[PDB]
């Protein structure tokens, strides 16, 4: 589990804006396949419906689901049937997907280990992608503490994200 090869950004936003901000990223980034992380199961459910309101296909997985159910979803996502996946935290989430070049923390985690489980990759060589963290004013404390505890750096999103970082 490594961060090397992952370009990490953040963006400041209000809670009531996160859905409008997420749509902007949908229109700004060259997403092959996406994964979007929320902090609660119901938050995963509602976000999935909001993304569908916007017109994109949406899968989703959370802990309260059934393992037999998460398998069908993950397998279909793998094969590429739907492009975006919203999900909560899972001890046994699964292998990494090669077509996922954009991970989004729709909600910023509180512990550094969770960030590593969300943004980490298997092996430093090969995989290339970007991570975008949506942080509220309140989340700032956890942002500096998380990078210091990890030894990584999370920079403000730039005007243009070079495709060579995730395409």
């Amino acid at each position: 589990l490594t961060l090397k090869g992952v370009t990490q950004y953040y963006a400041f936003v209000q809670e009531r804006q996160k859905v409008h901000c997420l749509n902007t990223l949908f229109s700004k980034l060259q997403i092959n396949q996406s994964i979007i992380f929320c902090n609660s199961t119901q938050r995963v459910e509602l976000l999935a419906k909001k993304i569908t309101e916007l017109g994109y296909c949406c899968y989703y997985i959370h802990a309260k689901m059934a393992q037999a159910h998460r398998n069908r979803v993950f397998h279909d996502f793998r094969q590429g049937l739907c492009r975006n996946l919203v999900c909560s935290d899972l001890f046994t989430r699964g292998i990494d997907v090669q077509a996922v070049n954009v991970v989004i923390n729709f909600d910023f985690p509180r512990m550094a280990e969770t960030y590593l489980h969300r943004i980490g990759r298997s092996g430093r060589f090969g995989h290339l992608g970007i991570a975008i963290n949506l942080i509220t004013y309140e989340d700032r404390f956890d942002l500096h503490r998380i990078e210091k505890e990890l030894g990584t750096e999370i920079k403000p999103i730039p005007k243009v994200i070079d495709p060579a970082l995730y395409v």
């Binding site: 400041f12 209000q14 809670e15 009531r16 901000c21 902007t24 005007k159």
Partner: peptide, 27 residues
């Protein structure tokens, strides 16, 4: 506690959107 999210309330489909030098979103 599971509250009603603030973003589930307001209209999700609005045009525009960008980020400024400080990384703050402009809706």
């Amino acid at each position: 506690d599971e509250n009603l999210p603030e973003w589930a309330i307001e209209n999700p489909s609005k045009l525009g959107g960008s980020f400024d030098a400080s990384g703050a979103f402009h809706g």
